[PDB]
Amino acid sequence: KVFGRCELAAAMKRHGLDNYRGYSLGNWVCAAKFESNFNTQATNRNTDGSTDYGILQINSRWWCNDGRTPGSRNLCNIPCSALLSSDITASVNCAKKIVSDGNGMNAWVAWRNRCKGTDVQAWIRGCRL
Numbered sequence: 344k345v346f347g348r349c350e351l352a353a354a355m356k357r358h359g360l361d362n363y364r365g366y367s368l369g370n371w372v373c374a375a376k377f378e379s380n381f382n383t384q385a386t387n388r389n390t391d392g393s394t395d396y397g398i399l400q401i402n403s404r405w406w407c408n409d410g411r412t413p414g415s416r417n418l419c420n421i422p423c424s425a426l427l428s429s430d431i432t433a434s435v436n437c438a439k440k441i442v443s444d445g446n447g448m449n450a451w452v453a454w455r456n457r458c459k460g461t462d463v464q465a466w467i468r469g470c471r472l
Contacts, residue, residue: 344429346381346398348372349470351431356472358435366448368472369463371438375399376466377453383434384427397426399434399451406437418444 346354352372360371378400379385387395393404393412401407401419408415409423419437426434441450448454 344383346375346383348376348381348466349472351375351381351398352467352470352472354431355435358432359439360435361472363439364442366442367463369466370448370454370458372466373458373461373463374448374451374454377457378451383429383431386427394423396423397428397434398431399438400453401426401434401437401441405450406441 352368355371356368360366361368375381375398378395379398381398383398385397385400387400389395389402391404393402394409395402396407396409401423403409403412403415403423405416406419407421407423407426408417419440421433421437426437442448448459
């Protein structure tokens with residue numbers, strides 16, 4: 344599935360990303376667009392043998408196990424293929440674990456290098472969220 348802008352903003356808000364541990368909704372929508380282009384089926388092979396999965400490009404060396412990554416930490420206790428779903432629940436729950444376990448949103452390359460410091464409210468402009 345490929346989300347629309349307000350569509351994804353509403354789904355993230357209704358899954359508790361309105362302001363999760365100090366990160367307002369616009370940050371999450373911004374990261375999803377830069378990481379996956381709003382595509383829940385997005386994958387990306389990395390140079391270290393890991394792979395990023397799903398709407399938030401969750402990495403297989405730290406957060407999920409895909410059976411293809413040597414030394415996967417699987418800190419979200421989930422198979423990576425489970426994050427390729429039209430419903431974002433599993434990715435949201437793992438994202439909450441990610442920001443809690445010492446990372447904040449710095450874990451996302453796209454958020455720390457592109458979203459941070461910008462007018463993130465422009466991402467939810469007009470959605471009434």
